[PDB]
Amino acid sequence: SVKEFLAKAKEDFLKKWENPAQNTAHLDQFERIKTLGTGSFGRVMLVKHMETGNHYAMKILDKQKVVKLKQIEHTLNEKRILQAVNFPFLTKLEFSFKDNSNLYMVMEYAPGGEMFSHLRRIGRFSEPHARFYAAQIVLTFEYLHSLDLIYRDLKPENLMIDQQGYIKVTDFGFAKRVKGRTWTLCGTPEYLAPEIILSKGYNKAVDWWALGVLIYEMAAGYPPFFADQPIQIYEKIVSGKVRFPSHFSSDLKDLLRNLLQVDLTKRFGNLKNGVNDIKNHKWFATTDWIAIYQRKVEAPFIPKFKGPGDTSNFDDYEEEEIRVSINEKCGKEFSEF
Amino acid sequence: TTYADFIASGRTGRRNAIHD
Ligand SMILES: Clc1ccc(C2(c3ccc(-c4cn[nH]c4)cc3)CCNCC2)cc1
Secondary structure (H helix, E strand, O other), X not given: OHHHHHHHHHHHHHHHHHOOOOOOOOHHHEEEEXXXXXXXXXXXXXXXXXXXXXXXXXXXXXXXXXXXXXXXXXXXXXXXXXXOOOOOOEOOEEEEEEOOOEEEEEEEOOOOOEHHHHHHHHOOOOHHHHHHHHHHHHHHHHHHHHOOEEOOOOOHHHEEEOOOOOEEEOOOOOOEEOOOOEOOOOEOHHHOOHHHHOOOOEOOHXXXXXXXXXXXXXXXXXXXXXXXXXXXXXXXXXXXXXOOOOOOOHHHHHHHHHHOOOOOOOOOOOOOOOOHHHHOOHHHOOOOHHHHHHOOOOOOOOOOOOOOOOOOOOOOOOOOOOOOOOOXXXXXXXXXX | OHHHHHHHOOOXXXXXXXXX
């Protein structure tokens, strides 16, 4: 029963939600190895934990930059939520801490790299390939939404492939716990639902829209709405017109028509039967949802690895100092972190 | 082709999040 697992899952989440773990490690417990990517106010590095020899992904945020970009509440959201959740297809926090200048979030390291890198290289996925990944996103969103969490940044850039070829959703900078509607203009242009673009209050339905964009991009090799500038893209999103490649199966087209539905009363995930509309759709008929959660299904692509701490599935970025001021920055703003 | 238009576009790389 999906109902029973989710009931326990919520009991587990609330306890950590109301009493967040805090200051569970320190910088010099970690050997910094390599940068796996960059963000506006920080970055993510491969590091090794000296005590265990375990490798981890460490998100390093510059407190001053966080404040400048008005991402204080959002970053508190990220840490508070990540420390509380636990699901196979999410990178949850193993440790978090802060020092004078930076915030730090340590999560399980995914050696396979981003879906983005592989999708772009190979061009496009087969429908079974794309269905294997979609199922894991369907289940994660089921989990998150039951906890009153909206994710708000689904894209291949945020999906890491693990050693078994399964996905981990990562980067929760825009994730929020909200009952009812919210108004923040956030996310990535290609993946924004029309509600967001038209400055309406919206809810978790925007995640199901973004699932529709992902599945399309995975199966097509490009997104359903693209252009050179964001404003050309929003023009296309609101218009309510998507063209599917001729190789798209009839079942896939029908699924996507129902995910990429501007009409909220008609959009799958947002209806009275919730996620089952998606789960019991014909395109997923072959999917064994339990086997997928248990990781019993054979992944259509297993990443190349040569020992632990291997980074050949990630791009090269310029390595930069982590400087720790002798003076505490932004102590009040990040007191609860 | 749509593929060719995509590949020729300025948005085949890592896409950044928006804000206000
Ligand atoms: Cl600040 C920041 C945010 C996100 C990343 C990315 C990232 C890379 C790796 C991991 C990671 C987590 N666990 N294993 C790898 C998370 C996020 C995801 C978005 N594309 C660039 C890389 C890097 C830096």
